[PDB]
Write a protein that binds this ligand. Structure first.
Ligand SMILES: NC[C@H]1CN(c2ncnc3nc[nH]c23)CCO1
Length: 251
């Protein structure tokens, strides 16, 4: 109770300790929360929102989390424009670092989007909100996912047409949609279904349409590898790390 809740960040409130003046974010949820807490405890990476502690008072549960003064990545995207390629690439590298770490401890976020990618004072990206995250590897054994989870414009196509599916290619897909957003300042489709004209157009290689026309050939080639319908053919992270644009030096 040494923390004063200065303002509502998003419920999540900015909290400043009276003694140290340290600033953290506090997630206030009145009663899923248990799993989020469990998952958070496992996490320790420079590109994932740090979990400090939790305190439960009565029916109210408090989660203490790293405060990112930068705010969300979503705010760094100019509509219809995106952001400078060098900034996009840097955010993308940090995003891959975060995801590689999560997948490495068998955890999938399941809702990767710019709203859930926060920035600190140095504009370092931090993966945020593990309320929908789940274990997909335990005791070295992979568990396929069955629950439909996410945000439609970012979800992989298999999630909509498959009874069960691999967790990793789904997170790669959403990262691809985030990259598109950063480079084009717009989302390619409402959802990845054939009833969706925009998705159908992409599967037909109509890259003279937006948002594809706005994207340079190098990053677009990477997007051609990520936004692949067949999750088995989809490029994996180790291979993304070998992509030409990924490795291209930028201003
Ligand atoms: N989408 C992120 C939530 C929570 N949020 C946050 N802002 C700053 N630091 C945070 N740490 C966790 N959530 C944070 C503001 C934006 O809404």
């Amino acid at each position: 109770e040494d923390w004063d809740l200065v303002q509502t960040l998003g419920e999540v409130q900015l909290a400043v300790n009276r003694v140290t003046e340290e600033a953290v974010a506090v997630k206030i949820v009145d009663m899923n929360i248990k799993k989020e807490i469990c998952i958070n405890k496992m996490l320790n990476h420079e590109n994932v929102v740090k979990f400090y502690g939790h305190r439960r008072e009565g029916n109210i549960q408090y989660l203490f989390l790293e405060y990112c003064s930068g705010g969300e990545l979503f705010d760094r995207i100019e509509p219809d424009i995106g952001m400078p390629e060098p900034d996009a690439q840097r955010f993308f590298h940090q995003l891959m670092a975060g995801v590689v770490y999560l997948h490495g401890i068998g955890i999938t976020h399941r809702d990767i989007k710019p709203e859930n990618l926060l920035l600190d004072e140095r504009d370092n990206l931090k993966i945020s909100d593990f309320g929908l995250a789940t274990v997909f590897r335990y005791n070295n054994r992979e568990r396929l996912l069955n629950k439909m989870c996410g945000t439609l414009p970012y979800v992989a196509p298999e999630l909509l047409k498959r009874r069960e599916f691999h967790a990793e290619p789904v997170d790669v897909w959403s990262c691809g949609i985030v990259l598109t957003a950063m480079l084009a300042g717009e989302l390619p489709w409402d959802q990845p279904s054939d009833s969706c004209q925009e998705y159908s157009d992409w599967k037909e290689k109509k890259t003279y349409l937006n948002p594809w026309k706005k994207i340079d050939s190098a990053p677009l080639a990477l997007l051609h590898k990520i936004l692949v319908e067949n999750p088995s053919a989809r490029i994996t992270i180790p291979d993304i790390k070998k992509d030409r644009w990924y490795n291209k030096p930028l201003k």
